[PDB]
Design a protein around this nucleic acid. Sequence first.
RNA 1: GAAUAUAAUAGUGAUAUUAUAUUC
RNA 2: GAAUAUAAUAGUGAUAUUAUAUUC
RNA 3: GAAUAUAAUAGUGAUAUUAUAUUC
RNA 4: GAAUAUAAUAGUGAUAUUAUAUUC
Lengths: 647, 648, 223, 222
Amino acid sequence: PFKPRNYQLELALPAMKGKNTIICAPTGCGKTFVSLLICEHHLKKFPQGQKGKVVFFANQIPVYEQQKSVFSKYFERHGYRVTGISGATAENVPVEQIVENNDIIILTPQILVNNLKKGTIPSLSIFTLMIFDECHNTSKQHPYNMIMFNYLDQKLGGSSGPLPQVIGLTASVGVGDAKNTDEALDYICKLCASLDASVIATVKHNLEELEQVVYKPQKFFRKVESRISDKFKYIIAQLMRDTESLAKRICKDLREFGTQKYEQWIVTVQKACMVFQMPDKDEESRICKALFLYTSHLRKYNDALIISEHARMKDALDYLKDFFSNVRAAGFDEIEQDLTQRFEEKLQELESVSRDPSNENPKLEDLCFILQEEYHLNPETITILFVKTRALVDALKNWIEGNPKLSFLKPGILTGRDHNILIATSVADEGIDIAQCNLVILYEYVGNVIKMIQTRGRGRARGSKCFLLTSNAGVIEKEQINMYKEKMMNDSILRLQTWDEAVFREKILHIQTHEKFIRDSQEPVPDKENKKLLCRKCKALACYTADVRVIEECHYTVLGDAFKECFVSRPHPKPKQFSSFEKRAKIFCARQNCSHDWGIHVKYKTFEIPVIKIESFVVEDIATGVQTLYSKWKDFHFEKIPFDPAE
Amino acid sequence: PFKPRNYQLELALPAMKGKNTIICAPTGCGKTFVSLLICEHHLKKFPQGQKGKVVFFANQIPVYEQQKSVFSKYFERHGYRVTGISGATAENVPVEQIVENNDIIILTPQILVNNLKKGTIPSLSIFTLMIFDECHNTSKQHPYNMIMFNYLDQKLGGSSGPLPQVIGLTASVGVGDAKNTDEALDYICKLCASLDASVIATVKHNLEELEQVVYKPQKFFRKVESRIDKFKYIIAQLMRDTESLAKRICKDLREFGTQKYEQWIVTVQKACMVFQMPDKDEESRICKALFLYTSHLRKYNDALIISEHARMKDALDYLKDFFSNVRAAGFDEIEQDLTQRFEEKLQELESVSRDPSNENPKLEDLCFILQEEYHLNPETITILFVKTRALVDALKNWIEGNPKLSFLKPGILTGDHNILIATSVADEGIDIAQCNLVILYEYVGNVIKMIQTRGRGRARGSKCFLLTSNAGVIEKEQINMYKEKMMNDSILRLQTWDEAVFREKILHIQTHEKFIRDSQEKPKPVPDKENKKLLCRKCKALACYTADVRVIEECHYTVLGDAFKECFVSRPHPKPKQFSSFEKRAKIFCARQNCSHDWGIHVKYKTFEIPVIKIESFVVEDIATGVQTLYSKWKDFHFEKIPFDPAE
Amino acid sequence: PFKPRNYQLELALPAMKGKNTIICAPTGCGKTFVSLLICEHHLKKFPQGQKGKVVFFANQIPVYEQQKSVFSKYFERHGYRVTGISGATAENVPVEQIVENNDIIILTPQILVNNLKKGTIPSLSIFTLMIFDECHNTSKQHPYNMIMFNYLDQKLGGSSGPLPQVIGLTASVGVGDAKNTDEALDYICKLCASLDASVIATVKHNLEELEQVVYKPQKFFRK
Amino acid sequence: FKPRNYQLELALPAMKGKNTIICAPTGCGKTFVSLLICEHHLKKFPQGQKGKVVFFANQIPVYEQQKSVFSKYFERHGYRVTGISGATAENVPVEQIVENNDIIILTPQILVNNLKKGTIPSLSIFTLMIFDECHNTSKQHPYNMIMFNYLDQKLGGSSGPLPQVIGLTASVGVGDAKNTDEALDYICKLCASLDASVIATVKHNLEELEQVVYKPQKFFRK
RNA sequence: GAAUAUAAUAGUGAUAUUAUAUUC
RNA sequence: GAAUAUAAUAGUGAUAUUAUAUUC
RNA sequence: GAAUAUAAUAGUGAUAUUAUAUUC
RNA sequence: GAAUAUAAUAGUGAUAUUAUAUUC
Ligand SMILES: *O=P([O])([O])OP([O])(=O)O[C][C]1O[C](N2[C]=[N+]([C])C3=C2N=C([N])[N]C3=O)[C]([O])[C]1[O]
Ligand SMILES: *OP(=O)(O)OP(=O)(O)OC[C@H]1O[C@@H](n2c[n+](C)c3c(=O)[nH]c(N)nc32)[C@H](O)[C@@H]1O
Ligand SMILES: *OP(=O)(O)OP(=O)(O)OC[C@H]1O[C@@H](n2c[n+](C)c3c(=O)[nH]c(N)nc32)[C@H](O)[C@@H]1O
Ligand SMILES: [Mg+2]
Ligand SMILES: [Mg+2]
Ligand SMILES: [Mg+2]
Ligand SMILES: [Mg+2]
Ligand SMILES: [Zn+2]
Ligand SMILES: [Zn+2]
């Protein structure tokens, strides 16, 4: 083995005495070793005639694989059978038998949730020690919090069995919407109540050792103003008012370009447009479809304005060109040809402006400055760059590759499902420990306190730096308050460590009883009338609510050979074997040049069936006639006829 | 059991004597009982230490089912096991054990062919009796003759195995293209050679009994005058420039409204797809335009023909349906242009389809006939035969679209009711309702079909009208009526021969044909290892490469790689069949814009879900030279054919 | 192919859930189509890597031939090999081979009894569904009861072989020498135990449909 | 991962279902051959059936290595990979661990003991067996014992569905043979020991194999 | 030839007799 | 999807086109 | 396909829209 | 502790001794 650091022993200590401990320590100080310590001690604690059963909850699959590997190779030599159950290997298997025949089990929490609800696992008394990776997640309706709901429901009751010790691991417990230390302490106590925790473990005695292991990178604030003059926006504005005029040639207008309020307004406008009714129901299709294409088009224009605001004009122009070309590759329409022909008119001027040197972004200029300087002082620099969207990932990557100034940069991509600089959208929690970046750069990217603290893990080496480039003061302040909330966090934790076990446990039990009472006191009318499901783009008859069958009380399919004529299929670009289903292809509308995303086509059990989403269908009651729109399927209450194999 | 006819015993007598014989009896005199009698005698002739094994050959599934049920219901009581194997129940089952563990096996011939070729069934020595239903099909490359090729190849060889007795069943052996009796004689001898028959059994000493059961319907010939042009001087110019705006693109070196015009448009269309162009981008535009133009032209031709044979209203509704489907398959500038030109002149029409002034005299003659025959007998059951499947519901809508024929209840028979409209039934087939009236609307086939059609009305008083506006049809029927005489006379002449002499003439012909077939084998392909690019035929978009194409069971062709998966779209198959070890899951079309040209189908082969394509939907470009060649069949396209391997 | 009565679906419902079921319905309601539905659904329920094997038990030869005919005509199209073995075609034939190589097998019960006793058929595990026509004969030592004796003797013993679902078809289970209610009930329970049944399917919801298809004839007594 | 060609050439006979003795120089990469064979074998069964692979390693380091690889590789595709060694074998239900998993890595002595104890009915529960260092399959070695069970069930009256056998080695040996024919018969005896019908060797991709694994020059000092 | 079931008739019954039907 | 047959048409023919039907 | 979380924006908020990420 | 393999040395060999290594 290897000699463990003293602060790791210090963090493991509260948990090794058998207390439900939330361990809060810096990202990358070696929490895995602590986990192995606590687990080893826990399993060694039991006498003859009984062997403990530990379970480790990991949120993401990489963490699942990592921890499963480490735990296996570490503990198998000591005679402890280690297993793991992920989403893939959790179907058609006796999960109960797998749990009982193993000492250590690495799980994703959704599995245990579904197993508890299904009843395959009776209670959590089977376990002796539950560990929560990224514990702080155990709030709201997170799977962690569901497991803990079962735990507390079993605890808070006369019929109580032997419950397992609950250990939590995190780098930040968070403080929520707190503005002062008291509210923060309240939030932290609520979290400890969520985990039935009585002790918060932080490094106190061996602080300096930890300060020589993990380092806090110096953070810098880069406030640059917007682009001075935008000819691009001056063109796209006019195009969008021409599109707005094309759309206003039909209906009433009941806002600023390049804004988010506009992006919401166009959504509500489109949603309101696909409700429009006509006795013809033929020209209605043309009007609604046009009022879909217009909306979507000027929406793409808005997106292009945002991209233009956060990157090169060439990036936005390439976004528009990409969009219109993908529209051109997928059939054609009179409206589509119209708008396109309108766009290519302004295209030449647009690239006359885009290929102009004076039309450069200062926000990218300062980034180029920081990159040039930091790579000049140290040409062995490993950079990471966080941005909001994927469009900005591609744009910044092409900007890096297409810049004489930055010919020393070999960019890489880290987008949700070697090099010098990685370009990523966001990473949930800490995740699998990646290569060390001595330069973190936040490009219009600011999250909460927990994410801020976790981000320090990227550069836990001495001399690491973290810049924050923005053209919005609200961003700067939003990052400023996070540090104050971290202060409030550590101070609240430090005051909470002064309390004695009795008082804290009493408070915890009190709170637990409180939201248990909230949950229990919390806990419908299906109109069996038939309704036509129409295409949200064509207003054409897709199906009927009677033909719709519901699988697993979550998924929805259509019955009859009548529906098979209404859609078309294209082999799924990203197939997946989720639950008891297997994605085979995507399903779109079939009426003329439409092809609107209706749903997918999957293999389920012994049937090849089409599954739809109500987010792309209009519900029309035949009697009343009025049309309505629904997002979640659960909002659409009706006679949900269950699925039967005899049809 | 049931008391049989005497002519049945007479027909079954040469077969029961153990001689390979062809039975020629009028349609519907009960050949089933003959089969049952022959089988019963053949099975119960054997001793105790030996057992017989009979195999029956039905060409189609209805006959398969019927014969299987009858044989099983009749022979089980006698202690014989009867089974059947068709294409549906042929997969994943040991057919040799099914054959061995049974006494009577009803088969579709393709099953036995495939099993013999594969090797699951060693030889035909297993059977002691083979019976061919509609044995007139024993010729050319038909599965029957494919079986008899095996039979003879074993017979005409040093390898000697106990070969089964061969019985044939038909109402006509045919005469081929014989101009005289001595040629028809040679044809019949050739057929008997193909079936290794030494006897031709017909009714003779009991004809007086037979002719009181099967009555020959009287055959009236109705020659009518043609239409005299409310739909001719309208679509004429339409065709004229719909050809010439295709000529606007390029010059291309023949009366309109005919079949020759169809062939012309077809070959032209198959000559436009190979227009190599350096621009490539607008090559797609040109080809996708010309394809649409020709596709409109030929269906215009179809409308013209339909008008020439039926109502003009249906000739309109045809085009209306066509443009409806075109508008439903996505709107194109060219398509909406031709559609605009069509609907511009559509106002002139429809009104023309609404005048009684221009009504097809053929349909009026048909109305006259039907009204007459249903006046004389209201309980008349009429069956009608048309050339194409287009004229079926055309004549149907003509019937109910007429108050004069309000006493008619049309029925359909293609792929309760007074009249049944149909295309063309293969052979005798499963027996349907007995008809008192048979009408042939421009429908004349071979002599065998003529003789077999008499089975539709084998009762007394049955009639058959041949309604046509062409003399060639009439003469084509008369030559058949002469061919029947030639056949019967040749048969009666052969029945005077000595059995031995006939046997050696048969043997002679057999050896001749065997030598021919043996020497017919040839060095056919030198596989081109050069990688060829397969493009679409309509929009000329790149479909795939020859390196990606795999061949399955030396017949079908799939595409590997994830590259091709982004080249096509799919919609659930209209008629989901199940052929071989496959299963039609859906259809497969192009993806380049709304081209939507049919490429093939998407099937479920074992544990794979794969695309299967037909070469007649693609253009074979050469990646090296650029010579765009076309192939109508996969076997005509010789290239480096790599057998499908699950390893991939 | 078409228009099944709703009471037929109601009767086939418990058997389409794998439950061993005795079906009790008036004579002439159409038990054949019920058998066809149950059997069909039983066949289409198996995945690709697995297959089913249904066996029908007819007590008489005419019923045998009729059922074999119907099942053959109906399931040939779908791709199921249907065969039959009676006393006339039972000698000098490989019953193991005939049973395996077919998906649906129609038998007279004495055949199965004899071939089980001989050892030619090892166990009933080869079957996935057994249907009994006139299942009220499952008593004393009628061939049905012997077959079920083998079934039970494999069930209750140490043998853990996968036993097939059991369906019975009758218009009257009988009461025997019962003189009151809970005697008749005990008799019926004894019969259900003889057939390993746990569900007795009868018409309850679609009575109004059935009573318009099958009429009870008025009875008279002339002394 | 970017595979080599000779690996595919070595795996191909095994993927066709034939029992195969793969003989290739040490260091060529038999691991990816194992992974490929296992992947193709498991992802070939229909829905109504499932595959069960068993991997035999004679040493604990090789055992934990292979277990690590197979677990980190087949978890994604949806196959439960587990391992049994001398440490964990005691006081555990073996047949349950075997049936509840798709890929089972173990030392041969384990399976021998559980076959002798009768806790496992037969090898029919497996569909693919893979002997690492299959040259050990001789004499009283555990490999040859397992194969003795296999052959006893094979040549016996019983007709249970037997798993296909893949062996992995760099040498098969020739024993105390003097000429090529005795060596041939000994090799045939080894093939009979593993019920193999094909000996996989690199042929059409030697130019690459030599580019990968080189042969060291030898010197003799007397 | 044998087996099986239903019914009537005597015995408390094991059953026996006859009738009827089915099966191998 | 593939194979086979029949009919018409172009052709000296091997063939080709279309129509129709069947089978695997 | 569905569920969960984070952030921005509208709203008093329960919520809603968008973006992002994850899970089954 | 037990089982197993490789090598050398004895011997006709089954085997034996020893060395080395592995596994349970
Ligand atoms: O088309 P398949 O490959 O699935 O095979 P099949 O049996 O239908 O062959 C029939 C031929 O006719 C054409 N076809 C097929 N479908 C489904 C249609 C058509 N033609 C029209 N006008 N409408 C159809 O729906 C094919 O070319 C095929 O070769
Ligand atoms: O599309 P599915 O119904 O199979 O579900 P999903 O898990 O794959 O989620 C995709 C959903 O997000 C939207 N979406 C964005 N982008 C860029 C894509 C894409 O490239 N391909 C697909 N199929 N969907 C995309 C969709 O709205 C979808 O619902
Ligand atoms: O016993 P068998 O070998 O004779 O065969 P079987 O089953 O057909 O006969 C059964 C018994 O019935 C008797 N029996 C024959 N006949 C013609 C009659 C009859 O007409 N009426 C009665 N009441 N019995 C008959 C046979 O003698 C045989 O014992
Ligand atoms: Mg085929
Ligand atoms: Mg006997
Ligand atoms: Mg789900
Ligand atoms: Mg021991
Ligand atoms: Zn639509
Ligand atoms: Zn195309």
